[PDB]
Amino acid sequence: YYDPETGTWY
């Protein structure tokens, strides 16, 4: 699940 909120490629 990508983390576009903060800025980390998850």
Side-chain angles (χ1 to χ4, degrees):
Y1 173 76
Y2 189 62
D3 191 90
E5 177 151 280
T6 302
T8 310
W9 228 122
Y10 270 99

